């Protein structure tokens, strides 16, 4: 029985205990290979975090490293650069920023959570459910808005004359000229993709042109219905909430379930080298690194706590289930869930902006 | 003012301005952080000029990370520190002496144009940068006139079994082949193409600097007659590279003497922000004959691009030059 170490960078000590138990139950599920848990919490600064990956995690020959967030949003980066130096797979558990889907920067990065951009998969499904064929896409001119725009337009062309796009620089408060162009384009369904601060600016200017009222349908994601954006959100808005996207224990026990399955698949192959033992004096990559990454991204785990676990070509999670929230009477109401491929109808009333009602029919 | 220079043992190098010279052949993430942090504490350094002797592209990834945490301008001069892949972080001051993928493809297309190599095939992996490489030369061929018949691009995966790479590689039916992949992947692709009789002199493999990399480490799996566009020009001496790097920093220091009235003091320590940095006055620097200006993405605007061929004596031969007047000068 040879030892295969798994790394982890988690939030608290209680979460590390859950990580060791997840690895412990993984060894119960079948024998010839024993998994060991190695973990630390986050460090004060990124330099010390990077040095902790070398001294505490890579020094123990970890085949993979799970990274979660510290208490109280680009903290996985030092883990990504240091372990990605040797092509060690880094599995993100909490971060949803779209910058981690660019393999030019984070080649060895995966995620049990989808990025904010993949919310366009649910937007595309509702355009088919209600037969919507003309929508207005308002995104911010940043790395997060570009990805939501590209993901949505890709789903439309793969059957851009079905959607118009309007962008704005983040931090702008004068969105008066922006929405005026949206109103002049025969706008009906508006899809917004911006941060919690930028969405609040769009909502305030929306009440200026009376685009909050009865002649519009607002389709958003998760950041646009959280915090100050929820306070100024127009009544009848429809946003998304990632199911289990914030647990950190569900994604620990699911990442371990996937890594354990991929480790056994790996050792069924010939010519396998051990991961590097520490950083100092080692400048060449892990020879099995790229292969093990390909084994991980090809892994299929349907029995996961957070649903079916599969990864796309960029390592982002697929088959993630969402909650379709509809703000009515200053309270978010779940009118249905995103099954993962379809939209399961919930017997609740959708209240469009203005006061009238419909449902997720057919 | 106070500048440090880190190099490797390659090219045989042994040693206002206050240069601090050192040489070590350890380029792992911990060694890179340790050297720069121990240089910052114990020597108020205002800029770093780095070079190594490896083909590890992730060294440039680490230097960019260190530059955004220490607020120290770092200049990739040679080796993996000069390999362009990831875009420079906007909050950093890390720049490299190298060219982008689009700048190399313009030279690669200029070679094929001057030799009437109109028919060519495209061979790429899923390695990052392949969709950028395909998209550039496709639009440049579709609308602008450098290629006439381009076979549909062939996608590969070196990590898969040889049988998978072999079945996909036989689909090539052109004399000129553009092969984009990592240097590690190129050793495997070209060693298998040789078994398929696709590395003979009746074929012309053109690869960017991601495949050639160091002009000093040549694997035996590279076939004789391999054409590449690289920027580790051995005539661009390592002694001259640090002179250009120092020139950029000293000019950026004197140009930062008046807009602000000071030079940013080095950070206290890496282990437990500035109102003005040398970020500006550094992306727009002319030194001696050529301008060493950079872009917001990190790479040079007018790089020392060069065309090289692999001699039958396992050596690279310089048979082209682009740096002059935005034109290709073949020999």
């Amino acid at each position, epitope marked *: 029985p040879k030892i295969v170490n798994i790394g982890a960078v988690l939030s608290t*000590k209680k979460h590390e205990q859950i990580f060791r138990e997840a690895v412990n139950q993984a060894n119960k599920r079948h024998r010839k290979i024993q998994l060991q848990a190695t973990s630390v919490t986050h460090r004060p600064n990124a330099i*010390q975090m990077a040095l902790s990956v070398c001294e505490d995690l890579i020094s123990s020959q970890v085949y993979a490293i799970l990274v979660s967030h510290p208490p109280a949003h680009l903290t996985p980066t030092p883990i990504s650069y240091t372990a990605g130096f040797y092509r060690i797979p880094v599995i993100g558990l909490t971060t949803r920023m779209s910058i981690y889907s660019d393999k030019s920067i984070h080649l060895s990065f995966l995620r049990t959570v989808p990025p904010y951009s993949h919310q366009a998969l649910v937007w595309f499904e509702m355009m088919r459910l209600f037969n919507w064929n003309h929508v207005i896409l308002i995104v911010s001119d940043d790395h997060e808005g570009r990805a939501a725009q590209k993901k949505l337009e890709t789903l439309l062309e793969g059957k851009p004359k079905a959607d118009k796009v309007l962008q704005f620089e983040p931090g702008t408060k004068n969105l008066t000229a922006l929405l005026l162009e949206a109103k002049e384009l025969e706008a009906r369904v508006i899809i917004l993709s911006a941060s919690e601060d930028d969405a609040t600016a769009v909502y305030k200017s929306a009440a200026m042109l009376d685009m909050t009222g009865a002649g519009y349908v607002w389709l958003v994601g998760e950041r646009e219905i959280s915090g100050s954006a929820l306070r100024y959100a127009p009544d009848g808005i429809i946003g998304l909430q990632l199911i289990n996207g914030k647990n950190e224990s569900a994604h620990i026990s699911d990442a371990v379930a996937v890594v354990a399955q991929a480790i056994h698949e790996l050792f069924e192959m010939e010519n396998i080298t051990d991961p590097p033992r520490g950083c100092v004096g080692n400048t060449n990559i892990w020879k099995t690194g790229p292969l093990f990454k390909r084994v991980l991204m090809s892994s299929k785990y349907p029995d996961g706590v957070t649903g079916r676990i599969e990864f796309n070509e960029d390592g982002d999670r697929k088959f993630a289930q969402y909650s379709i929230m509809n703000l009515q009477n200053r309270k978010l109401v779940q009118v249905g869930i995103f099954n993962g491929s379809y939209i399961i109808q919930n017997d609740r009333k959708i209240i469009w902006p203005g006061g009238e009602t419909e449902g997720t029919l057919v | 003012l106070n500048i440090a220079v880190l190099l490797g043992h390659s090219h045989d190098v042994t040693e206002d301005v206050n240069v601090v010279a050192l040489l070590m052949n350890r380029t792992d993430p911990k060694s890179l952080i340790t050297h720069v942090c121990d240089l910052m504490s114990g020597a108020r350094i205002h800029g770093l000029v780095f070079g190594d002797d490896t083909d590890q592209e992730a060294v440039a990834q680490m230097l960019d990370f260190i530059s955004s945490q220490t607020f120290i301008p770092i200049l990739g001069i040679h080796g993996g520190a000069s390999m362009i892949m990831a875009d420079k972080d906007p909050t950093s001051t890390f720049f490299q002496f190298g060219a982008s993928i689009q700048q190399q493809a313009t030279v690669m297309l200029k070679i094929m144009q001057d030799y009437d190599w109109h028919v060519f095939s495209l061979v790429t992996t899923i390695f990052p940068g392949y969709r950028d490489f395909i998209s550039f030369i496709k639009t440049t061929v579709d609308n602008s006139f450098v290629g006439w018949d381009m076979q549909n691009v062939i996608t590969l995966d070196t990590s898969f079994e040889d049988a998978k790479t072999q079945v996909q590689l036989k689909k090539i039916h052109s004399s000129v082949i553009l092969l984009y992949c990592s240097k590690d992947e190129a050793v495997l692709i070209l060693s298998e193409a040789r078994s398929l009789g696709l590395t003979g002199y009746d074929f012309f493999w053109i690869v960017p600097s991601l495949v050639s990399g160091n002009t000093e480490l040549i694997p035996k799996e590279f076939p004789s007659g391999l054409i590449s566009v690289s920027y580790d020009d051995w005539d661009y001496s390592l002694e001259a590279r640090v002179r250009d790097g120092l020139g950029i920093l000293t000019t950026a220091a004197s140009s930062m003497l008046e807009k602000f009235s000071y030079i940013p003091e080095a950070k206290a320590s890496c*282990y437990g922000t500035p109102l003005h940095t040398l970020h500006q006055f550094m992306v727009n620097v002319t030194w001696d004959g050529k301008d060493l200006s950079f872009t917001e993405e990190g790479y040079q605007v007018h790089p020392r691009l060069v065309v090289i061929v692999l001699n039958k004596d396992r050596e690279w031969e310089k048979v082209g030059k682009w740096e002059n007047q935005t034109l290709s000068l073949r020999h």
Partner: antibody
Amino acid sequence: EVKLVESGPELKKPGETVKISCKASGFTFTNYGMNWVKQAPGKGLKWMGWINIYTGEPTYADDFKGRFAFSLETSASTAYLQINNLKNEDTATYFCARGYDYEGYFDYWGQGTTLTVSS
Amino acid sequence: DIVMTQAPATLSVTPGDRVSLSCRASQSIADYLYWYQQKSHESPRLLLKYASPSRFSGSGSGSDFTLTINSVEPEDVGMYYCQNGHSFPRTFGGGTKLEIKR
């Protein structure tokens, strides 16, 4: 290449003050905690306390609450142990062990500092 | 305060046998139960991490733990302490001296 080298043995009369050093090497000093363990000649291990290294926050035990003090010098990567008003029961060997992840297991120990307290 | 009690405090094994040293706790300490080996004239050395060389293995999990040596070597002679790392103040066990047959 991780090492913890302590100062040499000491001899002190009852009622004096000792200062024991413990210099580290091979790892980032501010990423771990520094524990202190006392061991009497025939007896076994007794935990005295622990001091966080990133934040100089000591945590003494109930028995060792009063006279023992944990000092720190991050510039030289060294932790100290100062004992005031020595009794006859302070004659023991004092180890410094690295706390993994600040409050985890003791993964690297020093060679030990033998302290003799008699007249 | 948690009291760690490991019994027996003395064992005599044969070169190649399987030794199992138990460690009991008054309260439940989850898996925060470390192990240390103090030889003749050295400082103690950390053996296992969180109740888990390739011959030392750890099992047990709340109040009852165990340290197993699947093949004892002549270099295994020494003391073995189990440390509570779950609640302050940190406490150690009484120790168990491991003598070997010959």
